[PDB]
Amino acid sequence: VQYGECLICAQKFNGLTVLPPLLTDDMIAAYT
Amino acid sequence: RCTTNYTQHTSSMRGVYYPDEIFRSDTLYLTQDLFLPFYSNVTGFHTINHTFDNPVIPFKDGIYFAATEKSNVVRGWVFGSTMNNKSQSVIIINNSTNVVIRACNFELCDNPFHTMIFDNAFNCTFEYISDAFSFKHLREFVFKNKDGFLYVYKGYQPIDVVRDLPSGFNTLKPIFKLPLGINITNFRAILTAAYFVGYLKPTTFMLKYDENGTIT
Amino acid sequence: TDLIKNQCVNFNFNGLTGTGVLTPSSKRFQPFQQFGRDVSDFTDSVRDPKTSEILDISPCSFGGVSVITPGTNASSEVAVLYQDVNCTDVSTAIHAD
Ligand SMILES: *[C@@H]1O[C@H](CO)[C@@H](O[C@@H]2O[C@H](CO)[C@@H](O[C@@H]3O[C@H](CO)[C@@H](O)[C@H](O)[C@@H]3O)[C@H](O)[C@H]2NC(C)=O)[C@H](O)[C@H]1NC(C)=O
Ligand SMILES: *[C@@H]1O[C@H](CO)[C@@H](O[C@@H]2O[C@H](CO)[C@@H](O[C@@H]3O[C@H](CO)[C@@H](O)[C@H](O)[C@@H]3O)[C@H](O)[C@H]2NC(C)=O)[C@H](O)[C@H]1NC(C)=O
Ligand SMILES: *[C@@H]1O[C@H](CO)[C@@H](O[C@@H]2O[C@H](CO)[C@@H](O[C@@H]3O[C@H](CO)[C@@H](O)[C@H](O)[C@@H]3O)[C@H](O)[C@H]2NC(C)=O)[C@H](O)[C@H]1NC(C)=O
Ligand SMILES: *[C@@H]1O[C@H](CO)[C@@H](O[C@@H]2O[C@H](CO)[C@@H](O[C@@H]3O[C@H](CO)[C@@H](O)[C@H](O)[C@@H]3O)[C@H](O)[C@H]2NC(C)=O)[C@H](O)[C@H]1NC(C)=O
Ligand SMILES: *[C@@H]1O[C@H](CO)[C@@H](O[C@@H]2O[C@H](CO)[C@@H](O)[C@H](O)[C@H]2NC(C)=O)[C@H](O)[C@H]1NC(C)=O
Ligand SMILES: *[C@@H]1O[C@H](CO)[C@@H](O)[C@H](O)[C@H]1NC(C)=O
Ligand SMILES: *[C@@H]1O[C@H](CO)[C@@H](O)[C@H](O)[C@H]1NC(C)=O
Ligand SMILES: *[C@@H]1O[C@H](CO)[C@@H](O)[C@H](O)[C@H]1NC(C)=O
Ligand SMILES: *[C@@H]1O[C@H](CO)[C@@H](O)[C@H](O)[C@H]1NC(C)=O
Ligand SMILES: *[C@@H]1O[C@H](CO)[C@@H](O)[C@H](O)[C@H]1NC(C)=O
């Protein structure tokens, strides 16, 4: 399984961005 | 001074060119412009023995031109309206050492081909001469009118054909944008081979741009 | 004027204006291309009219700023979060307001 993001960071001139979740995949994996 | 077959073919996927001076990379771009339609009806002309095709051909706001050479028979073109010294017209030729472009009220030869193109030139409004220089070859051109300018594209590839125009495709690159300011409705080919004329249409195309920004 | 690089500037190229950060690039421009664009309809890079060098144009850092507080009936204190920004630039632009 565009917009501003960060993994180093980068931004776009369209004013759009996506925020991260509280729970990361590893934290989810721990629960499962 | 002056000394005085329309075979139809297929355009294949030829007549493609870069629509603008904008760099792109790794992307599909959809647009519309005066491009040669795919698999359109292309008119062939020949220069064989006693028969030399050099008729006045309608421009229709933009045409596709190609020619197959082994002896550089085709030297240039004349674009204009009345095609005489009544008004402006432009002569675009390979003058054998330089490319020469002039827009004037030319008293043209009825059967042009020594440089026998016109006897006189009046009221010249534009002149240009390129840098000096000195079937086997396919030459491709696109001629478009825009805001008084004659936009010219050029391309080239090696060939091995006798009479036909080999199927395939090629993206052409711009070479001239001439601020002629003249009325081009008709044109003639200037001969010292075979050549082909198509017509451009405001057709929608999806163009595939590669990593280096070229069209593949 | 000389090129001012690796910082937000107000630029004016012969046909392209705006603000942002100029950095060198390797974009494979053709002999008949002056500037390029991103996938979306925004300027990506420009060839310099004097030196013929090609530089990319990055946006100046921006985003949402939020405050973290306890209740005002408990205490008066606050932490400030600058979304999506390298703290090196945040700090620099505080000292260099
Ligand atoms: C916030 O900005 C600072 C300063 O730009 C970043 O620290 C720097 O991170 C790079 C890794 O991306 C470190 O290594 C450098 O790699 C390049 C790759 O070609 C190399 O040319 C450099 O010589 C260097 O090796 C760099 O040393 C490091 N700078 C310092 C002073 O430590 C920081 O990572 C940025 N943080 C975020 C979240 O973007
Ligand atoms: C484009 O230039 C040609 C130049 O040949 C013009 O055609 C020429 O026009 C003259 C005037 O009507 C024609 O008659 C000539 O008159 C002079 C007067 O002294 C005389 O000496 C000549 O013997 C002749 O009688 C001349 O025959 C004619 N040329 C031809 C080949 O017919 C033409 O009109 C110009 N076009 C425009 C739109 O100005
Ligand atoms: C457009 O981008 C392509 C990238 O695919 C460039 O083509 C590639 O250019 C390299 C450089 O000569 C070619 O040789 C390669 O060298 C490396 C060196 O270690 C070697 O490992 C590779 O196996 C290869 O030999 C590479 O073959 C070539 N690829 C293709 C498909 O042509 C291309 O030159 C760029 N065009 C321009 C005008 O820059
Ligand atoms: C814009 O005009 C300036 C006028 O000085 C040009 O600056 C100079 O251009 C030359 C040509 O590329 C640069 O390279 C020089 O080439 C000679 C060749 O023998 C070499 O001996 C020199 O050591 C040097 O490599 C020269 O560095 C450059 N000078 C500066 C300060 O930039 C500039 O190139 C022109 N721009 C374009 C696109 O023509
Ligand atoms: C074909 O090109 C040549 C070279 O450009 C032209 O001859 C030159 O004409 C200029 C004047 O415009 C002279 O000063 C050069 O000395 C000429 N050079 C040579 C080698 O003759 C020539 O006139 C062009 N032919 C036509 C019909 O335009
Ligand atoms: C030459 O022109 C004639 C005109 O009718 C046409 O029928 C003929 O097919 C043309 N030649 C070729 C090879 O098409
Ligand atoms: C294209 O050329 C062929 C040649 O025979 C002709 O039959 C056909 O009608 C032409 N199409 C158009 C749209 O002119
Ligand atoms: C030259 O062109 C102008 C208009 O562009 C026209 O008025 C003038 O009479 C022309 N001269 C000649 C000799 O044709
Ligand atoms: C070009 O010539 C044609 C001939 O009828 C005319 O209708 C057209 O308006 C002319 N164009 C210009 C720009 O003069
Ligand atoms: C809220 O205000 C009341 C007012 O007396 C105070 O007693 C209470 O402790 C306050 N809450 C907190 C968390 O301090």
UniProtKB/Swiss-Prot annotation, chain A:
Disulphide-bridged cysteine pairs: C6-C9
Highest taxon listed in the record's lineage: Viruses
Known function: Acts as a viral fusion peptide which is unmasked following S2 cleavage occurring upon virus endocytosis.
Protein name: Spike protein S2'
Native source species: Severe acute respiratory syndrome coronavirus (SARS-CoV)
Gene (UniProt): S
